[PDB]
Design an enzyme around this catalytic site. Structure first.
Site, PDB file in Angstrom:
ATOM      1  N   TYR A 164      -9.655   8.270  10.694  1.00  0.00           N
ATOM      2  CA  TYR A 164      -9.160   8.807  11.963  1.00  0.00           C
ATOM      3  C   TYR A 164      -9.963   9.993  12.519  1.00  0.00           C
ATOM      4  O   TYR A 164      -9.552  10.595  13.505  1.00  0.00           O
ATOM      5  CB  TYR A 164      -7.669   9.138  11.814  1.00  0.00           C
ATOM      6  CG  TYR A 164      -6.873   7.913  11.377  1.00  0.00           C
ATOM      7  CD1 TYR A 164      -6.887   6.756  12.147  1.00  0.00           C
ATOM      8  CD2 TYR A 164      -6.138   7.902  10.192  1.00  0.00           C
ATOM      9  CE1 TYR A 164      -6.183   5.625  11.768  1.00  0.00           C
ATOM     10  CE2 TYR A 164      -5.430   6.760   9.795  1.00  0.00           C
ATOM     11  CZ  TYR A 164      -5.456   5.630  10.596  1.00  0.00           C
ATOM     12  OH  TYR A 164      -4.786   4.487  10.254  1.00  0.00           O
ATOM     13  N   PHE A 207       2.111   9.782   3.069  1.00  0.00           N
ATOM     14  CA  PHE A 207       2.456   9.721   4.496  1.00  0.00           C
ATOM     15  C   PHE A 207       3.021   8.372   4.957  1.00  0.00           C
ATOM     16  O   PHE A 207       3.599   8.293   6.036  1.00  0.00           O
ATOM     17  CB  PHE A 207       1.280  10.162   5.387  1.00  0.00           C
ATOM     18  CG  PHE A 207       0.052   9.288   5.292  1.00  0.00           C
ATOM     19  CD1 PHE A 207      -0.018   8.077   5.971  1.00  0.00           C
ATOM     20  CD2 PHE A 207      -1.054   9.698   4.555  1.00  0.00           C
ATOM     21  CE1 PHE A 207      -1.153   7.280   5.898  1.00  0.00           C
ATOM     22  CE2 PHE A 207      -2.189   8.899   4.471  1.00  0.00           C
ATOM     23  CZ  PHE A 207      -2.237   7.686   5.138  1.00  0.00           C
ATOM     24  N   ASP A 208       2.841   7.321   4.159  1.00  0.00           N
ATOM     25  CA  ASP A 208       3.357   5.989   4.480  1.00  0.00           C
ATOM     26  C   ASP A 208       3.308   5.103   3.239  1.00  0.00           C
ATOM     27  O   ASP A 208       2.478   5.311   2.348  1.00  0.00           O
ATOM     28  CB  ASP A 208       2.535   5.344   5.614  1.00  0.00           C
ATOM     29  CG  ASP A 208       3.163   4.057   6.154  1.00  0.00           C
ATOM     30  OD1 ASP A 208       4.355   3.789   5.885  1.00  0.00           O
ATOM     31  OD2 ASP A 208       2.461   3.305   6.858  1.00  0.00           O
ATOM     32  N   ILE A 239      -8.332   0.014  10.140  1.00  0.00           N
ATOM     33  CA  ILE A 239      -9.448   0.971  10.097  1.00  0.00           C
ATOM     34  C   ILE A 239     -10.622   0.420   9.283  1.00  0.00           C
ATOM     35  O   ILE A 239     -10.461  -0.481   8.450  1.00  0.00           O
ATOM     36  CB  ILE A 239      -9.040   2.371   9.554  1.00  0.00           C
ATOM     37  CG1 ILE A 239      -8.334   2.290   8.186  1.00  0.00           C
ATOM     38  CG2 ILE A 239      -8.152   3.103  10.551  1.00  0.00           C
ATOM     39  CD1 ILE A 239      -8.132   3.648   7.543  1.00  0.00           C
ATOM     40  N   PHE A 247      -5.783   5.540  -0.273  1.00  0.00           N
ATOM     41  CA  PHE A 247      -4.846   4.417  -0.263  1.00  0.00           C
ATOM     42  C   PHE A 247      -4.818   3.704  -1.614  1.00  0.00           C
ATOM     43  O   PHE A 247      -5.866   3.318  -2.142  1.00  0.00           O
ATOM     44  CB  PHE A 247      -5.212   3.406   0.811  1.00  0.00           C
ATOM     45  CG  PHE A 247      -4.856   3.829   2.201  1.00  0.00           C
ATOM     46  CD1 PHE A 247      -5.771   4.542   2.983  1.00  0.00           C
ATOM     47  CD2 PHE A 247      -3.632   3.468   2.761  1.00  0.00           C
ATOM     48  CE1 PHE A 247      -5.459   4.904   4.284  1.00  0.00           C
ATOM     49  CE2 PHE A 247      -3.319   3.822   4.067  1.00  0.00           C
ATOM     50  CZ  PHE A 247      -4.230   4.547   4.827  1.00  0.00           C
ATOM     51  N   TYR A 282       0.806  -1.215   0.000  1.00  0.00           N
ATOM     52  CA  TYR A 282       0.000   0.000   0.000  1.00  0.00           C
ATOM     53  C   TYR A 282       0.836   1.259   0.000  1.00  0.00           C
ATOM     54  O   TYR A 282       1.970   1.268   0.504  1.00  0.00           O
ATOM     55  CB  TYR A 282      -0.967   0.015   1.202  1.00  0.00           C
ATOM     56  CG  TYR A 282      -0.301   0.248   2.535  1.00  0.00           C
ATOM     57  CD1 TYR A 282       0.193  -0.813   3.291  1.00  0.00           C
ATOM     58  CD2 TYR A 282      -0.141   1.534   3.033  1.00  0.00           C
ATOM     59  CE1 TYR A 282       0.816  -0.591   4.513  1.00  0.00           C
ATOM     60  CE2 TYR A 282       0.487   1.762   4.243  1.00  0.00           C
ATOM     61  CZ  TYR A 282       0.957   0.701   4.981  1.00  0.00           C
ATOM     62  OH  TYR A 282       1.565   0.944   6.191  1.00  0.00           O
TER      63      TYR A 282
HETATM   64  C1  LIG Z   1      -3.101   4.618  13.389  1.00  0.00           C
HETATM   65  C2  LIG Z   1      -2.823   3.149  13.060  1.00  0.00           C
HETATM   66  C3  LIG Z   1      -4.129   2.322  12.908  1.00  0.00           C
HETATM   67  C4  LIG Z   1      -4.606   1.835  14.279  1.00  0.00           C
HETATM   68  C5  LIG Z   1      -5.993   1.238  14.227  1.00  0.00           C
HETATM   69  C6  LIG Z   1      -6.160  -0.139  14.309  1.00  0.00           C
HETATM   70  C7  LIG Z   1      -7.435  -0.688  14.255  1.00  0.00           C
HETATM   71  C8  LIG Z   1      -8.551   0.137  14.133  1.00  0.00           C
HETATM   72  C9  LIG Z   1      -8.385   1.512  14.058  1.00  0.00           C
HETATM   73  C10 LIG Z   1      -7.108   2.067  14.105  1.00  0.00           C
HETATM   74  C11 LIG Z   1      -3.932   1.127  11.969  1.00  0.00           C
HETATM   75  C12 LIG Z   1      -2.755   0.257  12.343  1.00  0.00           C
HETATM   76  C13 LIG Z   1      -2.751  -0.978  11.930  1.00  0.00           C
HETATM   77  C14 LIG Z   1      -1.654  -1.967  12.233  1.00  0.00           C
HETATM   78  C15 LIG Z   1      -0.263  -1.422  12.462  1.00  0.00           C
HETATM   79  C16 LIG Z   1       0.581  -1.245  11.473  1.00  0.00           C
HETATM   80  C17 LIG Z   1       1.979  -0.747  11.781  1.00  0.00           C
HETATM   81  C18 LIG Z   1       2.725  -0.057  10.622  1.00  0.00           C
HETATM   82  C19 LIG Z   1       2.775  -1.010   9.414  1.00  0.00           C
HETATM   83  C20 LIG Z   1       2.088   1.269  10.188  1.00  0.00           C
HETATM   84  O1  LIG Z   1       2.948   1.862   9.199  1.00  0.00           O
HETATM   85  C21 LIG Z   1       1.819   2.293  11.322  1.00  0.00           C
HETATM   86  C22 LIG Z   1       3.089   2.562  12.135  1.00  0.00           C
HETATM   87  C23 LIG Z   1       1.339   3.650  10.773  1.00  0.00           C
HETATM   88  C24 LIG Z   1       0.739   4.550  11.866  1.00  0.00           C
HETATM   89  C25 LIG Z   1       0.066   5.796  11.276  1.00  0.00           C
HETATM   90  C26 LIG Z   1      -0.920   5.442  10.153  1.00  0.00           C
HETATM   91  C27 LIG Z   1      -1.482   6.736   9.557  1.00  0.00           C
HETATM   92  C28 LIG Z   1      -0.169   4.592   9.120  1.00  0.00           C
HETATM   93  O2  LIG Z   1       0.821   5.430   8.500  1.00  0.00           O
HETATM   94  O3  LIG Z   1       0.337   3.427   9.778  1.00  0.00           O
HETATM   95  C29 LIG Z   1      -0.965   4.019   8.001  1.00  0.00           C
HETATM   96  O4  LIG Z   1      -0.442   3.900   6.916  1.00  0.00           O
HETATM   97  C30 LIG Z   1      -2.354   3.541   8.137  1.00  0.00           C
HETATM   98  O5  LIG Z   1      -3.189   4.431   8.171  1.00  0.00           O
HETATM   99  N1  LIG Z   1      -2.678   2.223   8.193  1.00  0.00           N
HETATM  100  C31 LIG Z   1      -1.679   1.126   8.147  1.00  0.00           C
HETATM  101  C32 LIG Z   1      -1.958   0.197   6.981  1.00  0.00           C
HETATM  102  C33 LIG Z   1      -3.381  -0.337   7.104  1.00  0.00           C
HETATM  103  C34 LIG Z   1      -4.390   0.814   7.115  1.00  0.00           C
HETATM  104  C35 LIG Z   1      -4.119   1.835   8.249  1.00  0.00           C
HETATM  105  C36 LIG Z   1      -4.527   1.333   9.605  1.00  0.00           C
HETATM  106  O6  LIG Z   1      -5.560   0.714   9.732  1.00  0.00           O
HETATM  107  O7  LIG Z   1      -3.730   1.654  10.639  1.00  0.00           O
END
Ligand SMILES: CC[C@H](Cc1ccccc1)[C@@H]1/C=C/C/C=C/C[C@@H](C)[C@H](O)[C@@H](C)[C@@H]2CC[C@@H](C)[C@@](O)(O2)C(=O)C(=O)N2CCCC[C@H]2C(=O)O1
Ligand SMILES: CC[C@H](Cc1ccccc1)[C@@H]1/C=C/C/C=C/C[C@@H](C)[C@H](O)[C@@H](C)[C@@H]2CC[C@@H](C)[C@@](O)(O2)C(=O)C(=O)N2CCCC[C@H]2C(=O)O1
Ligand SMILES: [Mg+2]
EC number: 5.2.1.8
Lengths: 83, 107, 83, 108
Positions: free
Chosen positions: B82, B36-37, B56, B99, B26
């Site tokens: 978010y 941003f990532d 998410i 994305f 992604y």
């Molecule tokens: C903020 C992280 C968020 C936490 C969360 C979990 C469950 C429900 C709701 C929120 C959840 C997390 C999941 C599992 C951890 C993954 C860890 C590593 C691979 C990620 O790079 C983390 C460090 C960053 C944090 C900031 C975020 C803005 C974003 O840059 O990921 C991102 O690309 C995103 O928006 N991502 C990562 C790629 C999948 C889509 C989305 C997401 O769902 O993120």
């Protein structure tokens, strides 16, 4: 006589330095905004990690209950297979 | 919600089910295209299990509509991402996210 | 004299401006160094989060197989109580 | 070559965590010179982990398991029981011996 010339030279040297002061100030002010945003990013990643660890804990708590229930159910199956 | 638009077609028949692990690449962007990532920048495919709320809501809904091999643009409104808080330094409050996601395989 | 006052005023303005330039230059250099270091901590926390998410996924996969084993053990127990 | 535990304040001397129990703690993490890299106290938020589930560095797993409820202790942890040769760039340098000021608040 010649002192009128040097006063004008130093005025132009002051303008040049004033310009440099502004270039460094602006460069510094831009870097300061990047840093504050990068520091904010660190805090946000920390809190994301705190959430992911709370999730691991919640899973392990559930894993604990499943391991207990599987162990007891296996024991009961062995007891039944004897009798 | 989330909008799903096709960039490149998948096989059109292998869709992920709950409890299956999705393996993807992604790129995450704001609405102006600013990245941003990205998992591609790391050369490390991202993995998550569908239906366990590991990601998410926009991903939960969006990726489940994709077939293996498909590359898609997911446009995610802030209520499915978010929301009003965002993530300071990364995601602004009330941000719509874009994305670019590729579903590489299921395991 | 006439010019000695303006020479003293130009000397004072130049040295004060130069000092301010030097401080802004130093601040910009220190902020750049601090930014590079904070950017490294951002990368490291990203990798910590990646690991914690891989840990969540692993727990979810293990829960799925533990549950499945529990179900097979229950079916087996139930069949022993019939047959 | 492991972890050393030095009591700062004593606990009840009776309630020790078992594997499978959630430990609720406050900690301050420091480098060997005393430089703070992290603190749950600065967040006003106790940290939680389950013992026996490989959730934390080995020095924690071994050190916290020696503590009773109410105990505050200094854990001095060698690199091999923490982050080794690699560390964590910008936070923990290569081959860092770590010092954690840890307090066991309760078990749940
Ligand atoms: C903020 C992280 C968020 C936490 C969360 C979990 C469950 C429900 C709701 C929120 C959840 C997390 C999941 C599992 C951890 C993954 C860890 C590593 C691979 C990620 O790079 C983390 C460090 C960053 C944090 C900031 C975020 C803005 C974003 O840059 O990921 C991102 O690309 C995103 O928006 N991502 C990562 C790629 C999948 C889509 C989305 C997401 O769902 O993120
Ligand atoms: C690198 C984090 C490491 C990953 C790991 C997990 C399992 C086994 C081995 C290592 C593991 C992770 C645990 C569970 C996640 C907790 C998330 C939040 C609370 C932490 O603030 C994280 C974001 C940071 C990451 C960098 C670390 C240098 C340290 O600052 O924690 C830290 O203080 C530490 O050294 N901590 C945190 C408090 C307990 C002691 C120790 C530790 O075991 O950490
Ligand atoms: Mg168990």
């Amino acid at each position: 006589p010649r002192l009128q010339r040097e006063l004008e030279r130093l005025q132009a040297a002051l303008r040049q330095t004033e310009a440099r002061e502004i270039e460094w100030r602006e460069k510094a002010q831009d870097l300061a905004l990047s840093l504050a945003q990068t520091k904010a990013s660190v805090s946000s990643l920390q809190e994301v990690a705190m959430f992911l660890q709370a999730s691991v804990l919640e899973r392990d708590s559930e894993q604990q209950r499943l391991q207990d229930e599987l162990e007891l159910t296996r024991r009961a199956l062995e007891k039944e297979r004897l009798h | 919600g989330v909008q799903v638009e096709t960039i490149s077609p998948g096989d059109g028949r292998t869709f992920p089910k709950r409890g299956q692990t999705c393996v993807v690449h992604y790129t995450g962007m704001l609405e102006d295209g600013k990245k941003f990532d990205s998992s591609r920048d790391r050369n490390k495919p991202f993995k998550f299990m569908l239906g366990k709320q590991e990601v998410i809501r926009g991903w939960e809904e969006g990726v489940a509509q994709m077939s293996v091999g498909q590359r898609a643009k997911l446009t995610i409104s802030p209520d499915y991402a978010y929301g009003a808080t965002g993530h300071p330094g990364i995601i602004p409050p009330h941000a719509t996210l874009v994305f670019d996601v590729e579903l590489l395989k299921l395991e």
